[PDB]
Design a protein around this ligand. Structure first.
Ligand SMILES: [Fe+3]
Lengths: 441, 442
């Protein structure tokens, strides 16, 4: 069984990390040595009673004993429009139906939650202060949203002031976590407005939040550096990595051959270091110049993009699709969002391949085909209007037919730092890096 | 009033909110008492593995999501005594003879350290790397920093499988990349057995990230590993990767950057390396930061060896309480710092040390020391005897007082890097609010 095999390899990896042999685990856990090997080999699943014993005697967490089962074994997971309709549920705010929510395609293995949210409350004006709008206070999640119909998008700025974005079909937005927001339909639309939202944690949720939450408020918040703009962000990084080195300013000065005057102007923001001097500073702090660099610019908390601003182009050179760049922010370089006009007759030429998680939604009125390859097998399935899909990273695929799709790409926890650490380990070691099948000696 | 059950019920209510379920909805869909649902949320009783199995079968949730980590370091600093390490001792035999003595040192469920005290019981009659007495491992997933005490031979294999040995002495140090085969022995004739402090830790490859990667096929998962063989190859791999995410054509890429197709072809064939000005242009066209396209300034060796005579040192702070010795490190892990600290300070009441990293401390000297620190608006003071170890949470202000010597390892954990930068854009006020919403009693 794929679950039992991966569950034993996971338990074996826990034992390797605490430097316990199967015999050491058996004695400390008070169980037979064959019982341990039975778990490691995947003959039987570990019992919660044994997990409780391990957590009571070892610096391990119960979380580490429960693996995620792959509910997307073919490479792509499609949910039908019919299934989504049956999942409909009405959300009432202020004692009246406000949202209609439907499940769309998602995987237990993918770190995103999509939202199909129909706007049932109708507003008579575009006033952000309209009492009919029922606000939330924000969430500790990233959120991309695609607008279909006459949707008003309300949000509050950091100072608490209410704003509104008058949206139409093809508009898109991103909101920084904890941005309060809500959605309504403008009175007079031929039908209720609709949003397709992608909610995801990126680098903020799961055990990353649990590492942060086990710190005091005073300590945990000190990770948040002053990134209000480029100049302040570059000083914040200079201060953080200076503290990490535990150098004095004199030693820092002698090591960079910078004068104390040149050093003081940097730490007082009087003079910003050049890129050549940032190379010298990074070498002296034993970090990379990349680590001292801020983002090229600081983005707005709220990014709104109307469809007229979406640059577009044909892809590939042969012209099978027309891509449309939806809303994006450089705070999330691995979050991509596209409108794709598909015009290509059915062929098994796989011309799309991207190293990201993908959420697909057929927003057109015509049926499309999706072809892909996964584990040396080529598949072909239909993606009707209202159908959605999850596509695993690096899956080679195409879309065929005449129609329109929504494509949302996120990096999950892999893209960025983890990917770079996995690159220094070497592709040769990827299999063992993914799931340990060997005892360490 | 159990803190764990309160936070666990807080976590359970968060799951229901993410799947758009009221507590009433959960009792119906799970077919269980609403008193039982509320009892779990309010922290009166722990949830059951049977109830979790039902939720995982009907909802887009994982069993992993229901179990939170309990803080075993509520004081901010956790100290393990030399006697606790002795009690955790276990002898490991290889080739039918005792080879290592393992002892645990300070580690927390909050911390990614797996620090081991390891005595080299096997004595070798030569310094031949191919000596059959050395019992090799297969490499492991943990990153490893190592501090050497005594006449230790450090064996390791190069990328092509050839065996090497480094002749280490007290104060030498090393870093070894995950999955590099290695082993340790004592040189015969030494007055005592060699000892290593083997500080192994995960970084950005364990936990939720490993589960996300492990649900992918090998051919898919392997494509995350970019060509970082050298600075030039890494620059092209990043350029290629982020160009693929943008889903632009070469022509549209050329028009967006105002680069010619020939200039663009020179970049993608490694014939020309983009300058920093050109990199900012490329990044803007790809909707990323130039920092995202930059590789590390150089690619480090897989094995880093540093003898003590190569360690730079300096007085810290200006007043002069400490002498910091800069041990082995690699820019592949810019948040991993290792120090040998000579403490010679008696009457100084200020907490003069503060760093935003997880810390491991080991008293490697012959004299006891005092640790002073503040955490949760409380001031503490404890003694760190020879052989005692400590874990210090990030940003805990502290000092060391007395005359002695300690080993210090600082690692970034899951937060430093990408997570810290995302938190910085969220803001310090909302970072506090996120943590505050985990402590809420419902
Ligand atoms: Fe090791």
């Amino acid at each position: 069984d794929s679950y039992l095999i991966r569950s034993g390899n996971n338990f074996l990896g826990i034992l390797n990390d605490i430097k316990r042999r199967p015999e050491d685990a058996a004695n400390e856990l008070g169980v037979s040595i064959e019982e341990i090997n039975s778990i490691i080999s995947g003959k039987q699943k570990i019992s919660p009673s044994l997990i409780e014993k391990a957590v009571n005697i070892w610096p391990v967490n119960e979380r580490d004993f429960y693996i995620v089962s792959d509910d997307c074994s073919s490479g792509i997971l499609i949910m039908t429009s019919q299934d989504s309709i049956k999942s409909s549920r009405i959300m009432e705010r202020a004692g009246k139906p406000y949202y209609e929510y439907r499940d769309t395609a998602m995987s237990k293995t993918a770190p995103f939650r999509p939202e199909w949210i129909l706007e049932l409350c109708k507003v008579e004006n575009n006033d952000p202060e309209n009492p009919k709008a029922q606000w939330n206070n924000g969430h500790f999640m990233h959120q991309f949203t695609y607008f279909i119909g006459e949707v008003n998008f309300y949000y509050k700025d950091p100072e608490g002031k209410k704003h509104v974005a008058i949206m139409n079909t093809g508009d898109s937005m991103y909101i920084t976590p904890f941005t309060p927001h809500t959605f309504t339909t403008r009175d007079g639309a031929s039908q209720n407005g609709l949003i397709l939202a992608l909610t995801y944690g990126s680098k903020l949720t799961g055990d990353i939040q649990q590492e942060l939450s086990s710190l005091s408020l005073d300590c945990g918040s000190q990770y948040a550096l002053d990134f209000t703009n480029h100049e302040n962000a570059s000083l914040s990084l200079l201060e953080y990595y200076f503290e990490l080195s535990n150098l004095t300013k004199e030693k820092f000065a002698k090591r960079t051959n910078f004068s104390m005057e040149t050093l003081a102007d940097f730490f007082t923001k009087k003079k910003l270091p050049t890129f050549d001097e940032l190379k010298i500073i990074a070498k002296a702090l034993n970090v990379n110049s990349r680590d001292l660099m801020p983002n090229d610019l600081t983005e707005s908390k709220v990014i709104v993009k109307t469809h007229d601003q979406c640059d577009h182009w044909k892809y590939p050179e042969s012209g099978n699709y027309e891509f449309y760049e939806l809303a994006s922010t450089t705070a999330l370089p691995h979050s991509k969002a596209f409108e794709i006009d598909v015009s290509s007759s059915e062929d098994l030429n796989l011309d799309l391949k991207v190293g990201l998680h993908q959420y697909v939604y057929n927003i057109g009125d015509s049926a499309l085909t999706i072809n892909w390859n996964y584990e040396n097998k080529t598949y072909q399935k239909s993606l009707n209007p209202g159908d959605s899909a999850y596509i695993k990273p690096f899956v080679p695929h195409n879309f065929r037919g005449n129609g329109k799709i929504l494509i949302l790409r996120i990096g999950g926890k892999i893209s960025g730092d983890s990917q770079r650490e996995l690159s220094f380990v070497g592709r040769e070691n990827t299999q063992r890096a993914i799931s340990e099948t060997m005892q360490w000696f």
